[PDB]
Write a protein that binds this ligand. Structure first.
Ligand SMILES: CSC[C@H]1O[C@@H](n2cnc3c(N)ncnc32)[C@H](O)[C@@H]1O
Ligand SMILES: CSC[C@H]1O[C@@H](n2cnc3c(N)ncnc32)[C@H](O)[C@@H]1O
Lengths: 248, 247
């Protein structure tokens, strides 16, 4: 039996198009996490609805590893823009993802108040063990061949640009524009709740991973959430997965 | 014969537990090591989770799939948020929650950044049960498990054992004003894994309790003392043995 491609999305709107594309489906739920097992172009594919945020993403990914032993993972869905060059509908291919919500601060007394510009990325949250030995990570690189394939397919996407970028994952939805700008300037983020958590689990299991995110919103351009972007992202991802399958 | 699962993030938070197990067998999958043995003749699995919300959720989910535990004790060290508490005191989690989850309202760049305006973003704790959405603003420690730990308070001789609210985040805060604000806003006793492990335990409907020793608190100038992690494990061993006596 052939090891499946695992394709993830957090919300119903981010998976319904993927699920509709599968043939010969069955649906499995364990705990809080649902999976649809079927085929695309005759090849096994599992679609996972992860639910939202880092804990949910890590659980859903781990459970998929244990149940399905996928050959690669595509985490996809929507995101908010951090780079002013990007607009709603543009797709970011994650050259890296990282836990943007991880914060450590030096000691300051009460009289100095609160200063988030002094909250630094706390890399221990991405530290893993490999065969028992500690391995530091400041980010997780998208598998570079998977990243490159998606960039090479850019002109197959009908609804915006496809760009490489850094995906900042956090249990956050930021709409303070000064904070978005600070995160972009500090971490070079393209967009901002699951990617790096799923990536962390994929790294632990040594399974190739790529994050593919459409901007559904950006407060840098007054562009409010458009759910149709989620459908467009899934269409691109289906094309992308079919191209991988043709190569298997 | 379903085991008790006992978790800690760091080596210092599990090696005392591991030393207590009889007939140990070790298993490593991905980044996560488990020791399967017995305490008082009953199956116990000790899990070294690694640090933070993603690691805790992965390690807990992996344990659910591999071992099907009957209850989960998540333990380790924490930082004080309540000025009444000192290094060495143990907090039993009446509830835990994702303190690091934030949503903010739209503000233009001219208005700057104001974390006091950020709201707790509860969607990060939302689950599905038989496919249907279930909101959570926190995860209650199993109240019988909580009560048992409080009832055993006088068996711990290195501080007080108190009920409190555990704030989980991928954060180590040392801005005292931020600690104070979080305490005032969320009533936290202490502050990187508990609510994430608790979320997975809720999804699998397995009783859960968080037990955290304060290894540090910047509210009293008390810096990290690793011996607190050993003392916490000693208490947890006693606690697990009491549960086992009752099985
Ligand atoms: C309902 S919570 C938001 C969901 O959509 C994603 N998302 C879309 N836009 C944003 C944004 N601006 N900030 C954070 N998460 C976002 C998140 O990864 C999560 O799964
Ligand atoms: C090495 S990162 C800190 C580890 O110890 C815990 N911890 C101890 N003290 C604190 C603290 N003040 N703030 C956040 N996490 C703490 C965390 O849950 C994590 O596993």
């Amino acid at each position: 039996a052939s090891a499946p491609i695992l394709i993830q999305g957090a919300m119903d709107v981010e998976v319904e198009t993927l699920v509709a594309a599968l043939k010969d489906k069955q649906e499995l739920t364990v705990g809080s996490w649902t999976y649809w097992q079927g085929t695309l172009s005759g090849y096994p594919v599992v679609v996972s609805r992860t639910e939202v945020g880092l804990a949910n993403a890590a659980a859903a990914t781990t459970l998929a590893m244990e149940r399905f032993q996928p050959r690669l993972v595509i985490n996809q869905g929507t995101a908010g823009g951090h780079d002013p060059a990007l607009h709603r509908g543009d797709i970011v291919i994650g050259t890296k993802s990282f836990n943007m919500g991880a914060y450590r601060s030096d000691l300051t007394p009460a009289e100095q108040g609160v200063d988030p510009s002094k909250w630094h990325n706390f890399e221990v949250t991405m530290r893993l063990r490999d065969n028992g030995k500690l391995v530091e990570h400041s980010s997780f690189a998208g598998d570079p061949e998977l990243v490159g394939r998606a960039l090479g397919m850019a002109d197959r996407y009908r609804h915006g640009r496809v760009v490489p970028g850094i995906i900042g994952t956090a249990d956050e939805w930021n709409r303070q524009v000064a904070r978005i700008n600070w995160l972009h300037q500090t971490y070079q983020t393209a967009a901002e709740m699951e990617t790096s958590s799923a990536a962390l689990v994929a790294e632990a299991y040594k399974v190739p991973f790529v994050g593919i995110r459409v901007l559904s919103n950006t407060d840098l351009h007054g562009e409010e959430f458009d759910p149709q972007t989620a459908i467009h992202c899934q269409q691109f991802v289906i094309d992308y997965a079919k191209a991988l399958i043709n190569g298997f």
